[PDB]
Design a protein around this nucleic acid. Sequence first.
RNA 1: GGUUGCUCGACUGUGAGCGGACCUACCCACUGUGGAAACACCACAGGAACUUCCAACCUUCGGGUGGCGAGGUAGGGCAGAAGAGUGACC
Lengths: 215, 222
Amino acid sequence: SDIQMTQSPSSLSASVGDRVTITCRASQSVSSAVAWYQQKPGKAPKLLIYSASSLYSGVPSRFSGSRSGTDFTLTISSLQPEDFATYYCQQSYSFPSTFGQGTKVEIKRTVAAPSVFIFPPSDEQLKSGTASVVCLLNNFYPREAKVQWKVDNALQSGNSQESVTEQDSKDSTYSLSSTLTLSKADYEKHKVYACEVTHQGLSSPVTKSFNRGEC
Amino acid sequence: SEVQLVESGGGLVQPGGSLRLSCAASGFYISYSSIHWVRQAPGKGLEWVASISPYSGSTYYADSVKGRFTISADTSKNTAYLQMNSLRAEDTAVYYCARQGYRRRSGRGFDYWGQGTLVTVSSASTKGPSVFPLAPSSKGTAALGCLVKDYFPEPVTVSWNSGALTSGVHTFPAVLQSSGLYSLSSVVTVPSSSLGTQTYICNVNHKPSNTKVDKKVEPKSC
RNA sequence: GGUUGCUCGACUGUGAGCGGACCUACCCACUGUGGAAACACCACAGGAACUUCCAACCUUCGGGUGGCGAGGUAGGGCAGAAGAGUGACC
């Protein structure tokens, strides 16, 4: 049978300098054969603890493993903002090896309202018959935000796609990019395109907008 | 130090097809260490795949690849391979190579990792991105960027001004168009005054299609 | 013929609590640690404990020394000896 590594929580928001505890509970005895890894977006994982308590070479003292039978805990005494990452427990006591499902850690800062822009579709695109309207929400926190496209004061539904940046670890903030997309035809039926942001840092829902054809 | 691991052989592959990921070791010899492949489907977690043990060549496999994958090492080439046959959609992942550390130093941890090669198992054919420019507003800072639209497969890369302009840049993660393709957009904020005099070119590279685009981003023409 | 000593000896034995520790070579194993080493390979330490034993050595004859994988094969050690001699004695 396979040893299961069942690691909780799935995700963790914490203030700078808090204590954070991640725990992993091996479905069988895995002796002390448990290693903890930090992985930041786009990077390979880096080793932190290896014998369930042994701080690898160069990992800062604010990390430490601790075993209690089949229960393994990685412990940050006081978060730094760099400590944004997804942490995985691994058992290498038996084959096949096994990883935790991972825990995502977020920085926590003061609120930052989003700087808001709106982009009307390029000319090269409108020749190719496509028409994307882009709305940016820059350098804000917490990631909680609501964007709403209104075309000619009509709220849109289902033709917008957004994506969010990870937390800029120095900044501790987020950026968002909502993209309404329309055929050239649907775009040429309206004048006013508008992006309605609702955020905790804004006391009133900011709207950036443009009219079709204003130079 | 010099301890380095460099994967390759990853890419787009039709369902059912084959691939042979490699891993060059640099700052150590692999004959004295255990070598492991770990994979990660997009936005999912780490998943152990295989490993080969020093001095014996003994091979161990994740159950989900047992009999479709084969891990093996060439000592002369200081290289480790992974033949993957009969690939399916769910093998789609970054495939990482890993050195199991020297026991006296790091237990059974994995103390050095490659940057991972990306394997993309679908049948839908490659296509390069049309790159369109996000002109800044005509009105003390405003923001400008590039809209990289309808490409496949991941990844693209956006730099600005041949990588000279690195500050303030947000290149958003691709989202999947219902069209099946990838779109994403990169932006950067600049103080307003540089507009007239500062050339703003984003460099968009999409290696799968052999597509490099450079798009100059100038202000509103009127 | 008896009694036995003496020498050759077929063969068998090496006996486990109310009671088994002989040696050597190879093989086959088990456990730990170490070898850049999760299995494989190698080296090395070690076979629950309390006992029991001296096939081994030394002895001032009081005692001491050294010694355990109930594995396989085998060459011997030590114990009986079927039998062959062969004496003293009746």
